Amino acid sequence: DEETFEEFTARYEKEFDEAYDLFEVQRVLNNCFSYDLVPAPAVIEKALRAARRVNDLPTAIRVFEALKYKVENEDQYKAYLDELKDVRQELGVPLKEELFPS
């Protein structure tokens, strides 16, 4: 059966809350982003929480880098990274483009 968008959101919130080490955080994020939809910002917020809980920085940068390669415009990336501004400020992860300035 096909999942609606909010059902997807609830399922990946529950999955990222239940993930317990780094293999599970990267697995949940891999098959989180391998659908035909950019995940809701609550799911990305739970992804950054779950990458913090397993004490691994660069996957929490890979959240935003995969969001950049996943989202369709250059403006929806701005809409995402300004709606995750306080979360990214609290955890303190950089974007990849402001980490490697070129």
Binding site: E72, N73, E74, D75, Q76, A79
Partner: protein
Amino acid sequence: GRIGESWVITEGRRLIPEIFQWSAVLSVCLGWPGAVYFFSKARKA
């Protein structure tokens, strides 16, 4: 909703290069013997 430029714009800007590149690639892959006939003696040139 509909943040950003429309899907028409942001997929036409990907497709319009690819139409010309596909036409070039297939016109090489199918119309290569035209060059041999063109340089050939049976065109009387």
